[PDB]
Amino acid sequence: RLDFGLLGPLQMTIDGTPVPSGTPKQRAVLAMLVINRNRPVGVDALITALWEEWPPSGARASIHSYVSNLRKLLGGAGIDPRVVLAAAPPGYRLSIPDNTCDLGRFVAEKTAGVHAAAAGRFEQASRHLSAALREWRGPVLDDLRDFQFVEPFATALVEDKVLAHTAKAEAEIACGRASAVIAELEALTFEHPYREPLWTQLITAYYLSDRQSDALGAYRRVKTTLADDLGIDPGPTLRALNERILRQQPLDAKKSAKTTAAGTVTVLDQRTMASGQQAVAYLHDIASGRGYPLQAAATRIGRLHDNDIVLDSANVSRHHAVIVDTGTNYVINDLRSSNGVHVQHERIRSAVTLNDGDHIRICDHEFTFQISA
């Protein structure tokens, strides 16, 4: 009877009917609880998410009132609000099945699409990916964009949205429908001009639709865009693709789609321990050997003691970085820090998806990111 939406303005629906979830601060409590579904969120964490550096004197009283209000709303679905939104010494926990959250459905459908493509079942990969993408209503938590915590979470989920758009195109191209994905890829390369995998699929689609000129033209366009805007060359995948197209060599779109999926299966596998219980990701401090579990959806890193991982050095920014677990990927975000964030020994420009074993540097602190620990 209860359903929650993060992929657009925050939504709480009872029996399919939206229920207004309160004032912005109360809505932010609900958002944090849905983001951290089935895990406790501490009262201190809630206070930080709501008021950042400046909570009012009665911040805890307000939290108590928001939980009370939310429970009254939840009780409209005929459930026990004290079980569904449970109070723990470690804070508050919203207990809801994954599939009752739009993000949870997105995760399940994307995973199903990956497994299908890995097995070379491109028709059902495409069907799953379409279902995944239908879960998106608008910008992540659009009604709460003024809250700091939304920014890295939204940015992280867009990484996954792009990957789904890309995998969907791969599947369609593999199914012989290159011509039919072109318009959507054109629109996506405008919304996401710097996403090279999107351009790779568009150029592939042009070329397999007997439009070599448009394919070559699109490569020239992305090359110009990346050069002027970012100061970078296109990656090896785009470069190799253009070379094939220049020489009018055949492409193997089925094999490409299979290869991509098989690579993703690997990542999906290391997240899952053999006993169904999901694996905990860790940052392992190289110098000290100390392991920092990535327990929550968002792990906050910086100099200030309110961070989840505290780096006590004067050169580290107050709030330096956040690693977000999207349910599919772990993505690190640089929070406009002075020194930046360095992954695999290069400065990240926005946010980057982390791979198991990645070297991460923040100022003088160096870590191995590990997905399986």
CATH topology of the largest domain, by name, is Serine Threonine Protein Phosphatase 5, Tetratricopeptide repeat
Specify the number of helices. 12
H/E series: EEEHEHHHEEHHHHHHHHEEEEEEEEEEE
Shape category: globular
DSSP strand count: 17
CATH architecture descriptor of the largest domain: Alpha Horseshoe
Order of strands across the main sheet: 8-7-17-16-13-14
Integer tally of domains? 3
Helical amount: 40-55%
Structural class designation: alpha+beta
Text of the CATH class of the largest domain: Mainly Alpha
Percent of residues in beta strands? 15-25%
PDB class: transcription
Keywords: transcriptional regulator, tetratricopeptide repeat
Assembly: monomeric
Entry title: Mycobacterium tuberculosis EmbR
Give the secondary structure arrangement, pairings included.
Layout: E1 2-5, E2 11-14, E3 17-18, H1 24-35, E4 40-41, H2 43-51, H3 59-74, H4 81-84, E5 85-88, E6 91-94, H5 102-118, H6 122-133, H7 150-174, H8 178-191, H9 196-208, H10 212-230, H11 236-246, H12 253-271, E7 282-285, E8 291-293, E9 298-302, E10 309-310, E11 321-325, E12 330-334, E13 342-343, E14 346-347, E15 351-353, E16 359-362, E17 365-370
